[PDB]
Amino acid sequence: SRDVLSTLKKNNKNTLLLFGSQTGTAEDYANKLSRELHSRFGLKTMVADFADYDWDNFGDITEDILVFFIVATYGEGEPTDNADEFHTWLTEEADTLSTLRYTVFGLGNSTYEFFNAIGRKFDRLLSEKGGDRFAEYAEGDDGTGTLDEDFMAWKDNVFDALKNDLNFEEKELKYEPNVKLTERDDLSAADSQVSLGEPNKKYINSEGIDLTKGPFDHTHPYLARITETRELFSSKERHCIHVEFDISESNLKYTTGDHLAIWPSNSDENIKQFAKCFGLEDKLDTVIELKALDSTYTIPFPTPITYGAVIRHHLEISGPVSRQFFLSIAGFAPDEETKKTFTRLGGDKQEFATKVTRRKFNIADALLYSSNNTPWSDVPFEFLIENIQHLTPRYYSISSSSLSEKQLINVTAVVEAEEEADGRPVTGVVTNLLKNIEIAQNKTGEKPLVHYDLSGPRGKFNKFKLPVHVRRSNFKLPKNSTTPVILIGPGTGVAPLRGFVRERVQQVKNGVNVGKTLLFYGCRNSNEDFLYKQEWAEYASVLGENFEMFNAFSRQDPSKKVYVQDKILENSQLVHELLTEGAIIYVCGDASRMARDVQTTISKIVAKSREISEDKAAELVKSWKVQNRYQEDVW
Ligand SMILES: Cc1cc2nc3c(=O)[nH]c(=O)nc-3n(C[C@H](O)[C@H](O)[C@H](O)COP(=O)(O)OP(=O)(O)OC[C@H]3O[C@@H](n4cnc5c(N)ncnc54)[C@H](O)[C@@H]3O)c2cc1C
Ligand SMILES: Cc1cc2nc3c(=O)[nH]c(=O)nc-3n(C[C@H](O)[C@H](O)[C@H](O)COP(=O)(O)O)c2cc1C
């Protein structure tokens, strides 16, 4: 069952789609492509996670399997955790792929240095080892917001290739369900077998089982009690939540610098608009059971389950709407006036961007706009279950020290919310959940923009619990305690750096010998958004001369912006001194602008301090990144 060639033969499949995904986008695309390949070309598709197979025999693959690689790039041009073992095999163990027929679409972000490293590497290596590239390589730029149209253009070119080079008959797209739904009027919330949205099937029965003993991962969260929350900003319109999770009654462990994954539930406001949009507002307590119609289709949540539990706890109903979604559901348009508007919107890239994407409509608002508020009654819920991605966990840099508090996890989450002129709320799913927990836990008297279910399924989230798991990072304090470190992280970039500073403080407290710690921080205003403002003096008083903090208040003076890079330039001789002593550089926070500005600044200080050209210094800083002498936690 770990042999992907055997699994292809047993399920009578001729098309493999492999996804390398961290936050689900690559998965969704594998899934969309699969159905459209099957519908339009009659190919027998199977979507496979790299992590579910071993690849030692992959070179044995025969010419009758068309392979599609949908692969995202992470870390410093690293593969996604799921793809890591496949990445090792190809680069290190793979000999030939003489009869592989493949094509590759890479997901990346061009604000990052190693743009689509994994897409390009794979597309190259597979060709070098004898593979037949049946459709041109393409790739997506999540940095410019073109990723979704990028994938769409690639898919069009892959259809051209199949029709015109492999000489395949192309039929129109039609919904071909991989799953069958049956309403169970004989079943209700009273029945213990029925999911009210628990994270997995191990949380639904669970009488003679300890749900506090792990292992905990992306398949199995721990329910962690939030023992403390505070608002960290002083501004009425902008919010950042300090969260304390208690893991003391569990086997969940983290190391300083690791990520916490927080499993979301959707907002009341969003669920209402969804249920309205598809006329399900009378059906949310109706139980359904799902039965797979394809041998390789996994049902993506526990069954049986209520409509409302699927929508609240399993479907990514909020987020930008793919134009591909309009093309897939258009068949189910309520009336002919809708059909005319909808096939025109779905067929026009620019008009779709102007009328759907730029207005920040959720699926619900976009379909209700198109149909002039007629419900999309004829949409089988099965279509929705296949064509809307699983609600995936959001990652947070742990801001606690595992040496200082092995038993607590802190995160530092800035809240993303706006209100449209029409009155629509556009909300970050996880961040507004945390703002909500903070408002409720502290009886603050603020009025939530959106509301969530803080008791969760059958009151199993009661005591302000969320489902979490820890994901190990490479973002680690140096092995040798004495190695100096340079910590740069404005705004919520400070989160993991608080973790680092708290660790080194506990190390000095433990009579350990600790290197120089330099921290560059930035925020708008020392009175407004200075994260953990009062802790730093306390940390200073324990670290003594071995700690120095430089703070860039970007709006303190309205006429002149001041950023960390400015504070770095004016302390350049200290910075370079610490680099001469082997200091490790840690840059955390905004990927899109700060990370690159800071990298340039460090390059300039290297260039002057060692009398080499700026480009030679930039190449030297880039090699520090490959060696892990320069480490980034930027999102
Ligand atoms: C390794 C890593 C570490 C991180 N560390 C931190 C950290 O320490 N602190 C931190 O605050 N964040 C951190 N992040 C970011 C974090 O994972 C989340 O992306 C962030 O908190 C927002 O998640 P959300 O679920 O609240 O918003 P999401 O639900 O993901 O929404 C994303 C954005 O889209 C908007 N939006 C909603 N609907 C639409 C629509 N229809 N059209 C367009 N836009 C829409 C939302 O308002 C929001 O602004 C980290 C990310 C990574 C990858
Ligand atoms: C922490 C982090 C690091 C990233 N590093 C890179 C990178 O080095 N190169 C790149 O091209 N894209 C990078 N990206 C962009 C992702 O590849 C992109 O968001 C992708 O569309 C996500 O795919 P997934 O949801 O399937 O995991 C990074 C994104 C994040 C959040």
Side-chain angles (χ1 to χ4, degrees):
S1 57
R2 303 282 306 179
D3 175 332
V4 80
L5 301 191
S6 273
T7 301
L8 281 173
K9 201 187 176 193
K10 290 179 89 70
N11 295 265
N12 192 246
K13 297 300 190 181
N14 60 26
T15 303
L16 193 60
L17 295 94
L18 296 165
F19 65 88
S21 211
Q22 193 59 50
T23 59
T25 312
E27 201 172 355
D28 191 51
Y29 289 173
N31 276 320
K32 297 173 161 180
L33 180 54
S34 204
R35 299 186 289 266
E36 207 162 340
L37 281 179
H38 164 74
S39 166
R40 300 185 86 154
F41 287 106
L43 286 164
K44 303 159 163 155
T45 58
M46 165 174 127
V47 169
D49 189 325
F50 282 115
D52 288 339
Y53 302 84
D54 304 329
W55 304 92
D56 308 285
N57 65 334
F58 187 55
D60 291 359
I61 195 168
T62 60
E63 58 266 58
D64 53 332
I65 316 271
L66 298 176
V67 187
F68 301 73
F69 295 82
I70 325 270
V71 285
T73 307
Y74 265 77
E76 311 278 12
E78 296 307 310
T80 57
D81 300 337
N82 90 298
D84 184 59
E85 290 208 356
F86 176 80
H87 180 264
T88 292
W89 171 81
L90 188 63
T91 59
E92 288 184 26
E93 279 294 283
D95 188 358
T96 49
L97 299 138
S98 303
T99 45
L100 172 61
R101 308 189 87 204
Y102 80 100
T103 183
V104 180
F105 175 93
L107 294 68
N109 177 327
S110 63
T111 73
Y112 286 92
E113 195 146 32
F114 303 102
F115 182 60
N116 268 296
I118 297 293
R120 296 159 169 203
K121 190 182 301 173
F122 274 21
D123 172 63
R124 183 173 55 75
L125 279 185
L126 285 161
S127 169
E128 286 184 355
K129 293 184 204 323
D132 162 42
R133 174 188 310 111
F134 71 80
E136 280 150 38
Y137 178 75
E139 69 197 358
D141 198 356
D142 215 22
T144 56
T146 72
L147 182 66
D148 203 82
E149 291 301 340
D150 289 347
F151 171 70
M152 220 159 297
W154 176 68
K155 180 153 66 67
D156 279 358
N157 288 327
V158 186
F159 293 163
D160 275 13
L162 283 176
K163 183 183 167 83
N164 303 320
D165 292 9
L166 271 54
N167 209 41
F168 284 9
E169 164 162 45
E170 190 166 0
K171 285 167 180 284
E172 290 166 351
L173 179 51
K174 191 53 232 143
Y175 177 53
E176 317 204 324
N178 282 290
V179 67
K180 182 55 177 210
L181 179 157
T182 313
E183 292 191 9
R184 290 284 298 270
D185 310 318
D186 62 298
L187 285 177
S188 63
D191 301 292
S192 66
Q193 28 163 335
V194 179
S195 172
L196 287 213
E198 292 86 347
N200 67 25
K201 73 207 267 170
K202 209 137 34 177
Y203 275 94
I204 280 147
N205 307 152
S206 65
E207 257 62 63
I209 188 174
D210 203 14
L211 287 165
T212 70
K213 312 291 128 207
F216 303 115
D217 57 78
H218 70 303
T219 72
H220 186 61
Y222 167 57
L223 300 198
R225 180 162 47 89
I226 296 170
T227 41
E228 197 206 289
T229 45
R230 37 179 162 110
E231 174 55 65
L232 293 175
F233 296 168
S234 274
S235 59
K236 282 200 325 185
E237 87 275 9
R238 206 167 148 250
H239 307 280
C240 187
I241 300 313
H242 166 87
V243 188
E244 178 171 299
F245 294 99
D246 197 322
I247 63 167
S248 72
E249 275 201 45
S250 97
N251 281 1
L252 190 69
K253 261 176 154 80
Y254 75 108
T255 305
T256 300
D258 282 338
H259 303 148
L260 193 66
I262 303 180
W263 296 45
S265 60
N266 286 306
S267 58
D268 291 356
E269 289 77 357
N270 287 158
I271 295 161
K272 207 220 210 312
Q273 194 75 348
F274 194 83
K276 176 141 100 220
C277 173
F278 295 108
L280 311 164
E281 64 271 90
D282 304 327
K283 288 176 132 167
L284 301 180
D285 299 338
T286 305
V287 174
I288 62 169
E289 68 177 14
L290 285 316
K291 192 82 194 80
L293 300 190
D294 182 291
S295 57
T296 57
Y297 180 90
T298 300
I299 298 149
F301 39 70
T303 175
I305 186 168
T306 62
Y307 285 110
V310 173
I311 303 156
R312 186 180 287 277
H313 295 282
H314 301 290
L315 287 188
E316 195 66 54
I317 52 164
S318 73
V321 181
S322 171
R323 199 167 46 86
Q324 181 52 46
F325 186 80
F326 271 39
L327 293 170
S328 308
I329 209 171
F332 300 123
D335 51 66
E336 195 192 318
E337 208 209 312
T338 302
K339 181 141 193 205
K340 214 93 67 197
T341 287
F342 206 68
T343 64
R344 193 197 77 242
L345 270 220
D348 184 323
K349 184 189 166 186
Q350 282 66 57
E351 191 182 49
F352 186 89
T354 297
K355 301 197 163 157
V356 178
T357 317
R358 96 161 287 257
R359 299 206 57 190
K360 285 180 193 162
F361 285 160
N362 298 311
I363 284 166
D365 311 301
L367 268 57
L368 279 183
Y369 169 100
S370 305
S371 74
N372 187 19
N373 288 308
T374 297
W376 289 62
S377 288
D378 308 312
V379 173
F381 192 65
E382 291 110 326
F383 173 97
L384 293 181
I385 291 162
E386 285 187 59
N387 286 262
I388 300 180
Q389 69 170 278
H390 201 85
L391 193 61
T392 72
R394 277 60 151 172
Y395 289 110
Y396 299 81
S397 318
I398 300 176
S399 57
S400 64
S401 152
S402 41
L403 178 67
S404 182
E405 44 272 340
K406 58 167 199 79
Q407 87 286 3
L408 312 167
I409 299 182
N410 291 155
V411 308
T412 304
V414 57
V415 179
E416 303 183 41
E418 67 184 30
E419 215 181 341
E420 291 301 294
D422 61 22
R424 273 187 307 117
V426 191
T427 59
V429 170
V430 177
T431 54
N432 291 272
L433 177 44
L434 290 169
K435 186 44 180 173
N436 240 107
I437 294 183
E438 183 264 334
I439 294 176
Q441 188 166 45
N442 297 113
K443 310 193 195 294
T444 69
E446 288 156 296
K447 209 273 171 281
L449 181 60
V450 298
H451 304 84
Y452 297 76
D453 173 1
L454 299 187
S455 280
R458 287 170 172 103
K460 292 176 173 165
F461 297 176
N462 266 312
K463 296 184 188 64
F464 302 107
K465 300 182 181 197
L466 287 186
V468 304
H469 69 271
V470 176
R471 185 207 160 256
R472 187 103 198 290
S473 66
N474 283 151
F475 195 80
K476 289 294 171 273
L477 282 166
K479 183 178 185 156
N480 187 333
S481 178
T482 77
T483 313
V485 295
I486 297 158
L487 309 193
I488 300 142
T492 54
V494 91
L497 307 181
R498 183 175 174 275
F500 277 23
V501 169
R502 282 184 66 78
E503 183 109 327
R504 272 157 88 99
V505 163
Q506 188 53 51
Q507 265 167 334
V508 157
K509 281 182 171 163
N510 287 9
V512 168
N513 191 23
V514 162
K516 182 70 180 218
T517 313
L518 228 82
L519 172 58
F520 297 88
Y521 179 64
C523 76
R524 292 167 175 202
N525 200 292
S526 78
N527 296 339
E528 194 188 320
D529 52 345
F530 194 155
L531 294 170
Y532 301 104
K533 178 182 205 151
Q534 206 167 268
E535 302 189 338
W536 305 108
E538 294 165 349
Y539 299 136
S541 172
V542 177
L543 290 178
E545 81 200 327
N546 269 343
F547 179 74
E548 278 189 67
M549 202 190 186
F550 307 86
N551 294 315
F553 306 117
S554 59
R555 307 199 189 175
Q556 215 74 55
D557 179 284
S559 62
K560 175 73 109 169
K561 297 264 164 187
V562 177
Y563 296 148
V564 297
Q565 52 266 50
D566 300 284
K567 284 286 167 150
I568 297 170
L569 281 181
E570 84 178 38
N571 297 278
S572 63
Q573 301 225 320
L574 183 44
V575 165
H576 201 265
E577 170 64 47
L578 268 51
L579 286 174
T580 77
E581 316 182 17
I584 319 297
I585 303 158
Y586 297 101
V587 177
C588 304
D590 174 55
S592 63
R593 292 180 150 289
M594 179 271 297
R596 302 150 98 211
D597 286 351
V598 153
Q599 184 160 339
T600 297
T601 302
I602 284 185
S603 289
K604 281 188 164 277
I605 284 163
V606 166
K608 184 201 237 319
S609 293
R610 315 193 172 185
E611 252 195 313
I612 60 182
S613 74
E614 203 152 296
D615 197 67
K616 245 153 195 207
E619 294 300 77
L620 173 54
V621 171
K622 205 184 85 163
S623 76
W624 295 353
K625 287 177 61 163
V626 180
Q627 291 161 28
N628 250 51
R629 197 270 167 93
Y630 190 135
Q631 292 183 36
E632 276 180 325
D633 185 24
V634 299
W635 65 82

